[PDB]
Design a protein around this ligand. Structure first.
Ligand code: NAG
Lengths: 336, 348
């Protein structure tokens, strides 16, 4: 960005006046990155009198900065956020960014439901417990559940493992570095298998889930950040531990900020910093707007075939509603 | 507290390009900023944490540098990740209660309730997983999930008492343990048929818990520093080296996890406290106590799977003090009822 911030200094600041019910101040969120993380927090606290209404700035390609932010907040009771473009899950004793692994899992399972597919995969197990348990619990349904085998990551062993499942459509999640072994390995990359990974997040580098603003630029990110700050300030109207870096330990989180929607987006989070009823879309690359909000269903490309036959088992079958042998009666809900 | 570290660095070269050192900063912000610019994690010393999460930030920074330091003054390590596969030798609270059920599986009981915050959730889930004729304790009846610091928690003891048995288990903060112990005298004066089991610290901080009934090197950290640093000694890579540049190096040392994996694989190559998984040790031995009088006699050969009790085996409850029978049956029963002519005729 660099000088872009100066532009962001005016427009987004003006965007505050878009919804500013008596906001005290919102001057700037100066980056002053200096290309270093070690003292970035040092100068962050140094600049941190008169408290601060709140400034957010963070963007690093390829998200292991959250714990430092959490410690800074604790050491200065800081509830401010920094970034929205990059995000990741963390449960630590502020932190508010677009991400929901469980939302991704439920969305993909929904897509499977209305797309009529049976997923017995596993990739390197970084925090495998979360995703695996989510899949297992969602297996306790009435339609899907045939594919439940698991897998493991690292070449011959990986090839044998991935060839021991097949089962047409498959999907796994892991880090990009570990992801590439998928293309590296039994070479069973047949077109009759579409894959979805939530863990890596980021973007391509097929079909996968991403945030609503993923296509949108940093402008909407700063708008959402300032809107969240304004909501928090309004809640406060109904102290950042003195912002001292040089009580024995502060303790609070989301004391005022609970939930709100702006820009047709439910800019809200759970007490656990979880995206509550968020909006996300799905990709389509040979990306494309394929994917969802209001706890509702959204899906384009209403296809009835499956590009299948990757193996002569589905045969075009049709007839007429004769009555003695062809019964056609109204179904809402589900068939009998 | 630096003499121990100085001796450790002196003894570092026993088996065999520098020897690390650190300065113990009480607070964390300055310790955090000095973590890297001062110098995988050759020094992993929590000096004397008088707080709870204060040892977390420097470890997180090292993980950001891919240096899984080994926590030393750690007993309840909520890391299992938020950090990056930080090393750790002392087993956490995770299995500290696990050993109980196996002991309980053969010592005295079969179905004894257990009690709870995140550490408690992890402990209870690990316990219930460990237990995959059959038996079950709280899983048979229930397990609590409460809020720390809730004074006057009387309904908890009340509902605990009314169950079939009096055998209980708990693991929580010092204040929570004290409150539950004090309530035990209330709400049917829990005892004479009840049991107790908590972390050794809970007993230690237990000023007022008599009937209730530990460590290997905790609170001493004396004879295990040597084997700890020795285990690091073999960490030397054979096949880059561990980079020491903080400023101007925004990337990540690809070597870091590469040799963290083998560090995990590394086993034995030591004695005494020495001799798994991710940042944890799969072996340890512990004793128990009965809290006779005002003395908490840490007597027991629990030693994981192998138990060798002796020396006044036990006087478990505060009321009985005799041999604990264990499971207790019930007399009163509540019975369903439905209206139907065959056998259900109801009139005013
Ligand atoms: C580590 O290096 C510094 C300077 O590079 C040196 O002064 C110090 O003595 C070394 N450590 C040991 C244990 O020799």
């Amino acid at each position: 960005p660099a000088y872009a911030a100066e532009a962001a200094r005016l427009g987004p600041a003006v965007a505050a006046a878009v919804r500013s019910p008596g906001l005290d101040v919102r001057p700037v969120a100066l980056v002053l990155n200096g290309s270093d993380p070690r003292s970035l927090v040092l100068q962050l606290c140094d600049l941190l009198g008169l408290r601060v209404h709140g400034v957010v700035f963070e963007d690093d390609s390829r998200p292991a900065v959250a714990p430092i932010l959490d410690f800074l907040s604790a050491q200065t009771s800081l509830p401010i956020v920094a970034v929205h473009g990059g995000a990741a899950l963390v449960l630590t004793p502020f932190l508010q960014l677009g991400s929901s692994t469980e939302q991704q899992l439920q969305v993909i399972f929904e897509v499977l439901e209305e797309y009529d597919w049976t997923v017995a995969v596993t990739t390197r197990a970084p925090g495998h417990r979360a995703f695996l348990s989510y899949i297992e619990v969602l297996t306790d349904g009435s339609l899907v559940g045939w594919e439940h085998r698991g897998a493991l990551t690292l070449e011959a062993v990986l090839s044998a493992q991935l060839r021991s499942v097949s089962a047409q459509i498959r999907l796994l999640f892991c880090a990009r570095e570990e992801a590439e072994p998928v293309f590296r390995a039994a070479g069973l990359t047949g077109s009759g298998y579409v894959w979805f990974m939530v863990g890596p997040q980021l973007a391509g580098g097929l079909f996968a889930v991403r945030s609503a603003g993923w296509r949108d630029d940093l402008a909407r990110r700063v708008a959402a950040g300032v809107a969240v700050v304004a909501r928090g300030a309004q809640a406060l109207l109904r102290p950042e531990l003195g912002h001292d870096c040089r009580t024995h330990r502060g303790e609070s989180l989301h004391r005022y900020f609970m939930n709100i929607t702006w820009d047709n987006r439910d800019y809200s989070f759970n007490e656990d910093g979880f995206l509550v009823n968020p909006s996300l879309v799905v990709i389509s690359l040979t990306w494309e707007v394929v994917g969802w909000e209001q706890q509702t269903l959204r899906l384009k490309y209403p296809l009835w075939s499956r590009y299948g036959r990757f193996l002569t088992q589905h045969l075009t079958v049709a007839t007429l509603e004769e009555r003695p042998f062809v019964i056609v009666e109204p179904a809402s809900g589900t068939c009998i | 507290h630096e003499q121990m570290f100085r001796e450790a660095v002196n003894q570092a070269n026993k088996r065999h390009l520098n020897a690390t050192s650190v300065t113990h900063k009480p607070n964390a912000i300055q310790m955090a900023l000095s973590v890297c610019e001062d110098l995988a994690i050759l020094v992993s010393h929590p000096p004397t944490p008088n707080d709870h999460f204060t040892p977390t930030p420097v470890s997180y920074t090292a993980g950001f540098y891919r240096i899984p330091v080994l926590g030393l003054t750690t007993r309840m390590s909520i890391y299992s990740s938020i950090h990056l596969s930080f090393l750790r030798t002392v087993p956490p609270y995770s299995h500290q209660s696990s050993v109980w059920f196996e002991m309980m599986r053969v010592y005295s009981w079969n179905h004894i309730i257990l009690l709870v915050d995140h550490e408690g959730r992890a402990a209870q889930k690990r316990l219930e997983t460990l237990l995959e004729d059959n038996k079950r304790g709280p899983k048979a009846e229930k397990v609590l999930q409460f809020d720390p610091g809730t004074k006057n928690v009387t309904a908890l003891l009340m509902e605990a008492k009314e169950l079939e048995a009096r055998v209980i288990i708990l693991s929580a903060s010092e204040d929570d343990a004290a409150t539950v112990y004090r309530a035990a005298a209330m709400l049917n004066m829990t005892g004479s048929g009840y049991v107790w089991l908590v972390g050794e610290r809970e007993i230690s901080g237990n000023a007022l818990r008599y009937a209730p009934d530990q460590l290997i090197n905790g609170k001493n950290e004396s004879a295990h520093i040597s084997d700890a640093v020795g285990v690091v000694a073999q960490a030397v890579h054979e096949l880059t080296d561990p980079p020491r540049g903080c400023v101007g190096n925004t990337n990540i040392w690809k070597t870091g996890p590469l040799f963290k994996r083998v560090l995990m694989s590394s086993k034995y190559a030591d004695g005494v406290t020495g001799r798994n998984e991710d940042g944890d040790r799969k072996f340890a031995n512990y004793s128990i106590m009965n809290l006779q009088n005002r003395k908490l006699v840490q007597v027991g050969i629990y030693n994981g799977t192998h138990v060798i009790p002796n020396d006044r085996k036990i006087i478990w409850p505060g009321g009985e003090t005799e041999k604990p029978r264990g499971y207790q049956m019930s007399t009163r029963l509540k019975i369903v009822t439905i209206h139907q002519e065959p056998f259900v005729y109801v009139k005013p």
